[PDB]
Structure formats: C-alpha cells, structure tokens
Write a structure and sequence with these properties.
Two copies of one chain form a homodimer.
Chain A (H helix, E strand, L loop, with lengths): L3 E5 L1 H10 L6 H11 L2 E5 L9 H10 L4 E5 L3 H10 L3 E4 L20 H10 L3 E6 L3 H9 L4 E4 L2 H11 L16 H24 L3 E4 L8 H5 L6 E4 L1 H10 L1 H11 L3
Parallel strand pairs in A: 1-2, 1-8, 2-3, 3-4, 4-5, 5-6, 6-7, 7-8
C-alpha cells in the first residue's frame, strides 16, 4: 500500500556548514520534515562533514517524528545512538573497511553482528544499507536485520544518463560514456534486479526501503515496485527546495510516490 | 533613492558541487535572479570551490541581467573576464598575497593597478571589495575604481552576536565571546564607521555597494545608510530559499531594502 517517505536533511546541513553562521537552521528544517514527511533521516558522519551530534540530540528532543539515524560502525557514533536512542539506525559505510566497491555496507565486517546486537538490545530498529544483490539480502536476514535499504545509486545514475542532459554537462560520469543501446540494456537489468531484490527481501520477512540518488524523475519506476515500502531521499529534495521551499518539495515528492 | 540588489548564487553552486549531479541547476537559478533581482553575482574562485567558468559563460550567454563577476588577480580568471566581458568585475582576494587581515582586498598588491586598467580598457566596470576604512576608500579613488564594495562582515557578525542566539550555538565566534557592553559599543562603532565610509565614497565620486554577511535581520540598519546604492547578498538568501524558494527569498529581501 502507501509508501513512506523519509527525508534526509544532510544537504541542509551542507549549506549550514559552508558558512558556519547557523543558517539554514537544521532544527527549523526538521520541524517541516516532521510535519510533512514520515521520518527524519540524517547521517552523522565520523568526520562531521554535515549533520552533527547536536543535530541528532536536538531533533530527538524537539521533533514529533520518527528519527532514522544513518551511521557507520565506529564506537563514537554507535555509543551516541545507544545513548540518544533514535527510532531507527541505518548502518552505512564510511571507512574502507566498511565499504564495498559498489557502495553498500560490507556485510562481512567483523563488528557488524555485535553492532546490530547492541542496537536491537537497546530497542532501536536496525536497517542495513546494502547493494541490491540477492546474496546480500540473504546475509542481512542471517544478521537479524529487520530492515534493508537497497542502494539505488547505480539505477539513478543510469536513469540520469538516459533521460536527462547530464551527459552533456561537466557532471557526466565517465563510466557511463557508452553507446545508448548498452546503457538502455544496463538500465533495464538494474531496474529488474531492484524488483527481484525487493521481492526476495519481502519473501524473507524483511522490510524493504530504497532511495540513494532518487530524484523527481528517476523515482517513478521505483514506485511501481510494490515490495518497497519506504524511500529515504535527501539531496534531490533539498535541491528542489531552493526553488519551491522545503514544504512544497516534500509534498511534491509525496504526490509522486502515491500508488 | 532605490537600492539595487545583486544576488550572489555561489551557495546554490555549493549545493550542486556537493553531489555532482547538476542539481540544483545554476542556470535555472540565474533565470530567477535575472527576473527578480537587479544583477547576478558569482565568484569564480581559482580553486573552483563552487561557481565554475561554465557558469559564467552560460549566464552571460543566456540571462537577461547585468552580471557581476567576483574574482581575484590570477591571470586565468582575469583572462576569462576579458574574453567573456561581464558587465562588472568585483575584485576580491583569494591568495595570502591579495588578502588583508580583515578580509578586504590588499590595495597595495603589485598587479592591482594593471588589472584595473585591463578591465576598464575592455569596458568592464570595476568594483574593489574593501575593508571599510577611509584610507582604503581614498586608495580606491586613486586606483580609478568606479565602484567600491564595503566589507560588512564584521558588522554582520557583531549584529548576529547581539541580536540572535548564535552565541549559544556551535557557530559562536570565539573572538566575540565578550561582555555585552563591549560588544554593543563595538557594534555602534562599526555601524557608524560604515556610514562614514559610505559618505566618503560618495564625496569622492565613487559608487558604494555593501553586502558580505548581510541577512534579513542585520540588513535593516544598513538600508538606513542613504549613500550605499547597492547590496550584493548571497548566503542568507540561499539559506532562506530552502524554506521559501528562491523567488520569494529574493522578493522578501527586496521588500526590506525599500526606502
């Protein structure tokens, strides 16, 4: 039935950290997400590139919304999650040791199982951010994750390449400078694979989310995958907000994911 | 009479460069500034942190608006200005050799005079971004600048410290952790000095602009300085746009600078 929208506010913090004058104010933005979205997502990186520990504290203390903290396996941020107790933690990679070549979390990491254990023991829901592969979905089930989040980045880039002007710009991805026929086949395959992976997740009793790189154009085929129950989207919504304001950017996305 | 508003779009490019997917699209934003603002400002840094050479090219070729390029004294960007011919160039410092301790351009720089010469010879209007000091205003007149832009940053920080919550946040400036009485006196002095400097500029036949750090609160005392004819504002407008959209953020600022 109805898809849930988590709004990742990281790129609002990107703007804020750029000038260091507390503007835009992330707690202000969070209040808007709280009202118009279904969950507030933020990634508190070890390197503190954007969202900060005080943002997580303030949002948990002040906002009427589930909170989805994205974080890696470092003790500092896991300890903070254990102390502050967001509703959900989505484990994402930061360090080489946590990363796979495609960007999903390495499910063989020596600390992953105990990390999941500690969070679940604290009654925090755990999602694993994973490459869309059937093998990783099975591994996630074995690790006792409730939730998985499929990495839509490669799908998103392929969609951008095929259906937008990006290849004509300075932002073109050299990897995707290929004939269109090949790209079309890769896109179809990647989209088919997303659907198969969502089906597998649901078959194993996992809840399936998606959302990295999703924008107001490439989201549409993803909405048609019935087995994905949630999307976490940030950068494209922040990018739209510059034109329409954050409330309207969220509401526009909500309208697209109706089904 | 009527204050002109230049909108600096650099922080829209900050968002764009953060994810490298051409979103937000700077040319889209420029069209909005073209319509609702009085000039489009952008700073093409040698290090290409945000606004890029292609942005300057595209805006000059596609937008119905005066363009104010901010740039430093490096040959690469000066040559680009000479080739593309924005309406105005505002010379700002980037390198240690160009910088003063307060952030204004060093008016003793060995290449400044010839740089001004080349630009004016190409029929490009030249503004110098300067600390608000009477000595620098006189030096700017001697250098044959048409325009000066007073560095309002220190004024802005003092206003933020006195009239907002910034001192209670992670963004508090350690330099301004001082008793309020001292800060109030510094603020009054800095504002008085801005007015005196604008008066001097006008007395010498210069056109006087201002605008760094200006926001929807600290702008108000600056509007009361009759001798400032133009404000160039970026970061606060981009920060407001996340909430209201860029058109509305510009129009709100235009309403504040009515007098």
């Amino acid at each position: 039935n109805a898809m849930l929208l988590g709004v990742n506010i990281d790129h609002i913090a990107v703007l804020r950290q750029a000038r260091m004058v507390n503007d835009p104010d992330l707690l202000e933005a969070a209040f808007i997400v709280a009202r118009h979205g279904d969950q507030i997502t933020l990634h508190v990186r070890e390197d503190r590139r954007h969202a900060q520990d005080f943002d997580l504290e303030n949002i948990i203390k002040f906002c009427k919304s589930p909170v989805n903290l994205e974080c890696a396996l470092n003790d500092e941020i896991l300890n903070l999650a254990l102390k502050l107790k967001p509703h959900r933690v989505t484990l994402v990679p930061e360090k080489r040791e946590e990363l796979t070549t495609e960007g999903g979390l390495c499910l063989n990491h020596a600390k992953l199982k105990q990390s999941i254990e500690k969070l679940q023991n604290a009654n925090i829901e755990v999602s694993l951010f994973i490459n869309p592969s059937l093998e990783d979905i099975e591994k996630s089930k074995i690790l006792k994750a409730q939730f998985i989040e499929l990495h839509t980045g490669h799908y998103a880039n392929l969609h951008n390449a095929l259906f937008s002007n990006i290849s004509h710009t300075a932002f073109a991805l050299k990897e995707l400078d290929q004939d269109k026929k090949t790209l079309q086949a890769q896109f179809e395959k990647e989209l088919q694979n997303l659907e198969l992976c969502a089906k597998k997740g649901l078959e194993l009793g996992l809840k399936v989310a998606a959302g990295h790189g999703l924008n107001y154009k490439n989201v549409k085929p993803v909405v048609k995958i019935k087995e994905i129950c949630e999307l976490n989207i940030g950068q494209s919504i922040v990018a739209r907000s510059v034109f329409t304001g954050l409330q309207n950017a969220i509401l526009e996305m909500k309208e697209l994911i109706k089904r």
